Design a protein around this ligand. Structure first.
Ligand SMILES: *[C@@H]1O[C@H](CO)[C@@H](O[C@@H]2O[C@H](CO)[C@@H](O)[C@H](O)[C@H]2NC(C)=O)[C@H](O)[C@H]1NC(C)=O
Ligand SMILES: *[C@@H]1O[C@H](CO)[C@@H](O[C@@H]2O[C@H](CO)[C@@H](O)[C@H](O)[C@H]2NC(C)=O)[C@H](O)[C@H]1NC(C)=O
Ligand SMILES: *[C@@H]1O[C@H](CO)[C@@H](O[C@@H]2O[C@H](CO)[C@@H](O)[C@H](O)[C@H]2NC(C)=O)[C@H](O)[C@H]1NC(C)=O
Ligand SMILES: *[C@@H]1O[C@H](CO)[C@@H](O[C@@H]2O[C@H](CO)[C@@H](O)[C@H](O)[C@H]2NC(C)=O)[C@H](O)[C@H]1NC(C)=O
Lengths: 490, 490
């Protein structure tokens, strides 16, 4: 049988068995599609899905899958938070039809169609007459990866994007820099990577970055960069002088450095020129600014910064200085026509945010109540908090992730519509190429289903059954996803 | 610099720098060795170590490493609990010398020698004049793998044995069968695997088994089979009729089966013929019989078995019947001239064990006190309890494993000499090819050092430093061992 994951909104199976012959089944454009043979996204997806599927017998052969895009295709464009991913799939003989408003929905449908196929004993490719109409519950469905704590070669990022397609994720939250290393190669500031990277072959070139973004685009995945300020910036200091706060002990200067120094005009003119470059390089609408876990110790220790605090009336409240900072950075982003996402502390520590500004809730301390507050104040929200997949544990933790119901928090029908989705996060301290893929999948698939499927989809026995088979399939396709429990594939 | 792991007993470094040239350094026999060019074990080890190492300049070139075996080589033989693994290593120009009593010690020394080499910036292979004299603290240093909960292809077992060599482990505890599947292919009982395996390509053939054993032997590793009775035998029932206990509810027979039925003469004549085959197939001295976690529910529910209990005077004490069973199996093993290892329950539940019988302590509930009791009664003991590496957790759990001091239990100098070592265990419920290697290494390396190195070797900063580098090396050699924490290799 078929393992669908994520389980589509409406499935209508019949017991009518159809067959696909490897020597002649193929996927092509409907003559009525708005996308042509000119469509690179779709053609490459036809080829790669033909591969996935393979590499009384009268009137039972499905010869073709025809793919029809109904509205302007968006074939040439980058996906975005409002990209229409809906499709319908009509599996019948002799010609199955996949129909979608846009390119994005057909990529989804191709995956689902591939999941409908199954071999019996003899190795006959089999699929049931069925009709599927599908669309996602939420539209921001993210994986966070961290390429600072460890560098991830591009290949592993590519493989992760493939896995994301298979699971219908659509945002790659690329936490590209942080304390330990700055691998991003900046054209306007070559020295950030030159001095901040682990070494000169742990770098992402403009070509590497172009590659990740196009490879994502071809799979209907947005690349959301995070360049976390003003904490988590140790590695930035190496290449930009006078950017970080010099730490002091009383009046003795220490060799150590703290967060970015929000009191200097050279800080903001650096950030202005830096984020201009980010806005040109990453085509997504949103830039993630970070703002998590700022340590005040070093700021409050610094003499010139203490001057700046009396000089503003901030007293001993270092939340106001952190706010002063992030507000200035928020303006920088608005000025070059992008949107901003922000870890919850920026909101908790009482910064003043332009409306439109997305807030990401990560702290697992009564997060429903954060979701309440954030939505109460009018701001779109995204949840990662219960999906910190760096935090491993013995056993079937996939259930814990799967059982989350993100909208079980206090608020109105309309507060709740500001919840635009979720991200599974795989912070990198303990993760690199050697262990990424099996740590991430299929644990993140639990999150994929919860974010795509109906609220009502919750049966644990049925989830286990479908996820065991989906995981076996991921492995067939070269994604080393780990087991759920005892058993075997083939 | 060099990362030694495990840290040898005595290292004496000088600051005299020597160089190895890739175009001409080579490893060969000392003309005074008891092993010849006829020695397969050593020749293959020379070749593969040459690969690992590579693939004022007067009087600084080390041209050769010469390898001298001093006593009868044991080149043709299988290692065993008394195999001498001691060696000494004299690194000097122009000819370094490795000298060992036996083949086993030279394999160890070759690894250590390889760990002494390091590249500087230009890519010059560099090593310091030094003198190392080394031997293990304990002689049973095991990895447990479980090929029932998941099948592991031979290749992954081979790769694990390579990793074990790199870490100076010397026992592969092959928990080959269990409840979920029986992959072992028996010549005298073809139906165990035919009906008990997951499928017919999740099997270990006599050729696969020969391969694992020889590949182990060539690396100075013993293969200790465990064929766990009488619990953990569900999969055995499929191919041997009337072997398992039929479960009952009152007088209603259930479809379900429990442990092996210790009351039938067909049970022991099966076991006799089965373990004869095991003794011929696996050349190691010891067979692990299991005896862990027997559930009595089903035994006590069975009518014929309740007859057997009144008929023995056992009352309601199902420990005595379990004992009656394991004692009979112990005799079977003694009769075909092998030794037996046994999970602690066999000892706790008050079975009568021939002296010589090794007891493995696994329960993490006051295990020092188990070590006391077991040694008090005269029995060799092995510890796994604090090294259940299936039980993952967030963070640097390698420290927890490393900080164990196994002889911190009550007893005499002579009780303590019955502690012959340890095993890191990677039970398979959550583990298969996709995730084995990074889950196991380098976490098991913590155990490798504790079992090889001096009791005194304990500094955590120094362990972290050497283990980070050893782990980077494991990765260079194609063992995908996971990170300890943030950072980079090369
Ligand atoms: C896909 O088609 C197959 C074959 O028609 C369905 O399987 C059969 O279902 C009937 C009841 O509807 C059973 O009596 C048969 O024993 C089933 N198996 C086979 C191999 O013939 C199958 O259920 C269909 N799938 C779905 C999800 O409806
Ligand atoms: C999100 O996606 C759509 C599709 O790319 C964008 O809107 C369309 O843009 C094309 C030109 O590329 C126009 O011809 C259409 O008339 C647009 N339709 C609209 C605005 O509804 C949209 O701008 C994208 N959003 C962001 C923020 O980039
Ligand atoms: C291996 O030899 C090197 C080079 O002699 C040693 O490194 C030098 O040690 C001296 C002090 O003994 C320092 O003053 C130098 O700065 C060191 N480094 C270099 C690159 O010259 C190294 O310590 C030796 N290794 C050990 C473990 O003794
Ligand atoms: C453990 O190893 C040694 C070496 O193989 C075994 O003892 C030697 O065996 C060879 C023949 O293969 C003899 O020529 C020696 O005289 C033996 N030396 C002894 C007994 O000290 C030993 O038997 C092995 N132990 C087991 C249990 O197999």
């Amino acid at each position: 049988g078929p393992a669908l994951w994520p389980l589509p909104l409406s499935v209508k199976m019949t017991p009518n068995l159809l067959h696909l012959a490897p020597e002649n089944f193929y996927i092509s454009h409907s003559p009525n599609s708005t996308a042509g043979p000119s469509c690179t996204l779709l053609e490459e997806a036809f080829r790669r899905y033909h591969g996935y599927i393979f590499g009384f017998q009268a009137k039972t052969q499905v010869q073709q899958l025809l793919v029809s895009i109904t509205l302007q295709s968006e074939c040439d464009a980058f996906p975005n938070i409002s990209s229409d991913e809906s499709y319908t799939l009509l599996v019948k003989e002799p010609v199955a039809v996949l129909k979608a408003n846009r390119v994005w929905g057909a990529l989804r449908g191709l995956e689902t169609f591939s999941q409908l196929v199954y071999q019996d004993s003899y190795g006959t490719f089999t699929i049931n007459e069925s009709t599927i109409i599908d669309s996602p519950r939420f539209s921001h469905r993210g994986i966070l990866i961290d390429t600072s704590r460890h560098y991830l070669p591009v290949k592993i990022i590519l493989k992760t994007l493939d896995a994301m397609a298979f699971n219908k994720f659509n945002v790659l939250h690329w936490h590209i820099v942080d304390d330990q290393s700055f691998p991003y190669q900046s054209i306007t500031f070559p020295e950030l990577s030159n001095k901040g990277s682990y070494s000169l072959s742990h770098v992402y070139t403009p070509n590497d970055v172009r590659m990740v973004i196009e490879y994502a685009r071809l799979r209907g995945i947005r690349v959301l960069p995070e360049f976390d300020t003003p904490g988590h910036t140790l590695s930035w200091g190496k290449g930009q002088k006078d950017l970080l706060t010099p730490c002091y002990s009383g009046s003795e200067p220490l060799d150590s450095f703290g967060p970015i120094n929000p009191t200097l005009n050279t800080t903001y003119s650096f950030l202005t020129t830096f984020f201009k470059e980010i806005s040109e390089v990453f085509p997504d609408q949103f830039i993630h600014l970070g703002g998590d876990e700022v340590e005040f110790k070093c700021w409050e220790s610094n003499p010139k910064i203490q001057d700046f605090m009396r000089q503003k009336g901030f007293g001993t409240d270092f939340k106001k200085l952190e706010s002063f900072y992030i507000q200035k950075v928020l303006d920088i982003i608005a000025t070059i026509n992008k949107g901003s996402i922000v870890w919850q502390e920026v909101f908790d520590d009482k910064a003043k945010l332009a409306p439109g500004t997305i807030v990401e809730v990560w702290k697992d301390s009564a997060y429903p109540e954060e979701l309440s507050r954030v939505t109460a104040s009018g701001f779109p929200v995204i949840l990662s908090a219960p999906w910190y997949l760096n935090r491993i544990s013995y056993g079937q933790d996939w259930r814990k992730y799967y059982k989350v119901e993100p909208l079980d928090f206090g608020g109105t029908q309309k507060q709740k519509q500001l919840f635009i989705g979720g991200e599974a996060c795989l912070w990198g301290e303990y993760v690199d190429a050697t262990n990424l893929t099996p740590r991430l999948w299929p644990r993140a698939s639990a999150v994929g289903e919860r974010l795509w499927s109906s609220k009502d989809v919750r049966d644990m026995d049925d989830a286990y059954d479908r996820l065991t088979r989906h995981r076996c399939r991921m492995v067939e396709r070269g994604i080393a996803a780990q087991p759920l429990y005892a058993g075997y594939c083939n």
